[PDB]
From a paper:
NCS-1 is a high-affinity calcium binding protein that plays diverse roles in the nervous system, including synaptic transmission and plasticity, due to its ability to interact and regulate multiple protein targets. At the molecular level, NCS-1 contains two pairs of EF-hands and a C-terminal dynamic helical region that inserts into a surface exposed hydrophobic groove and acts as a ligand mimic in the absence of a binding partner. Neuronal calcium sensor 1 (NCS-1) interacts with D2R in a Ca2+-dependent manner. Crystallographic and biophysical data revealed that these molecules bind to the both spacious and conformationally adaptable hydrophobic crevice of NCS-1, overlapping with the D2R recognition site and thus competing with D2R for NCS-1 binding.
Crystals were obtained for full-length NCS-1 in complex with ATV and NCS-1ΔH10 in complex with AZS and VLZ (see Experimental Section). The crystal structure of NCS-1 in complex with atorvastatin revealed four independent NCS-1 molecules in the asymmetric unit. The 2Fo–Fc and Fo–Fc electron density maps showed NCS-1:ATV complexes with both 1:1 and 1:2 stoichiometries, where the drug occupied the hydrophobic crevice of the calcium sensor. NCS-1 molecules B and D contained two atorvastatin molecules: the first (ATV1) binds near the entrance of the crevice, while the second (ATV2) is positioned deeper within the cavity. In contrast, NCS-1 molecules F and H contained only one ligand (ATV1), located at the same site as in molecules B and D. Differences among the four NCS-1 molecules are limited to the ligand-binding regions, and within each pair (B/D and F/H), the protein structures are virtually identical, with RMSD values for Cα atoms of 0.151 Å (B vs D) and 0.155 Å (F vs H). Notably, in both cases, ATV1 is buried within the protein interface and shielded from solvent by an adjacent NCS-1 molecule, with F58 acting as a lid. ATV1 engages 10 NCS-1 residues in helices H2, H3, and H5, forming 355 contacts across a 423 Å2 interface. Binding is dominated by van der Waals interactions, with aromatic π–π stacking playing a major role. In contrast, atorvastatin and vilazodone also localize to the upper half of the crevice but extend further into the central region. These small molecules partially overlap with an inserted helix H10, suggesting that the compounds disrupt the dynamics of this critical structural element, thereby hindering its proper insertion into the binding cavity.
Residue numbers in the entry: 6 to 189
The structure:
């Protein structure tokens, strides 16, 4: 009940984890999902555990789709560990690029005001009452307006990856959120 040697080596080379950390995360992954394939409902259950005082269902669905690389409706361990690596230990640039993919719902190379608003409304639902909101950003629409004011340099209503990267790095509050390693 362990990973084959070849897979351990492969996954270690593709992530910021060590061999022992990979084998350890697999033990926990298998314990919760014995088949090794996480379903949308199971992934939903996990996110409900991160945010018990809100509704993470909509956001969890968007996240599930992004990191289901091969789009087969299941998150296998290889997809899980690589997602976890970028999201928990990646550099700022690598995290930003996965953040862009999440906001680019149709993967067409632009984030529209409507694509972003859908995600941000999911984020506000997920938080719930667990974050006091300044009045100037107490709605998804207000947050989106501020973001596109800061980042849409050509004012075409869409964000390229270049606009999203430079705009995010300009805001000290965004830089901090994307510069953590194991939550620190
Ligand atoms: C280690 C724990 C905090 C964690 C995370 C996480 O790090 N999230 C985190 C939060 C913030 C920043 C970075 C990471 C994720 C976790 C979940 C989703 C995405 C990323 C990490 C999970 C986890 C839960 C259920 C699963 F099916 C698999 C893993 N788990 C739980 C694993 C644990 O059930 C092992 C099991 O053996 C214990 C038991 O059965 O009693
Ligand atoms: C679960 C965790 C590893 C995660 C994911 C994710 O879904 N990964 C995952 C893992 C395995 C399988 C599938 C998915 C994404 C994550 C990243 C991109 C898109 C969707 C989710 C993030 C995360 C990282 C930086 C951000 F700016 C925001 C969120 N994080 C880290 C969140 C953490 O910074 C929250 C913060 O509020 C707490 C703190 O201050 O430490
Ligand atoms: Ca998959
Ligand atoms: Ca798009
Ligand atoms: Ca633009
Ligand atoms: Na590694
Ligand atoms: Na996408």
């Amino acid at each position: 009940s362990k990973l084959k040697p070849e897979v351990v080596e492969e996954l270690t080379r593709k992530t910021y984890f060590t061999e022992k950390e990979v084998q350890q995360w697999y033990k926990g992954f298998i314990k919760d999902c014995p088949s090794g394939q996480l379903d949308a409902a199971g992934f939903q259950k996990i996110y409900k555990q991160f945010f018990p005082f809100g509704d993470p269902t909509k956001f969890a669905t968007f996240v599930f789709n992004v990191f289901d690389e091969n789009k087969d409706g299941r998150i296998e361990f290889s997809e899980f560990i690589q997602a976890l690596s970028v999201t928990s230990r990646g550099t700022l640039d690598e995290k930003l690029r996965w953040a862009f993919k999440l906001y680019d719902l149709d993967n067409d190379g632009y984030i529209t005001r409507n694509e972003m608003l859908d995600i941000v409304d999911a984020i506000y639902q997920m938080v719930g009452n667990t974050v006091e909101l300044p009045e100037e950003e107490n709605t998804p629409e207000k947050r989106v307006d501020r973001i596109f004011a800061m980042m849409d340099k050509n004012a075409d209503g869409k964000l390229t990856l270049q606009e999203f990267q430079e705009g995010s790095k300009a805001d000290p509050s965004i830089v901090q959120a994307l510069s953590l390693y194991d939550g620190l």
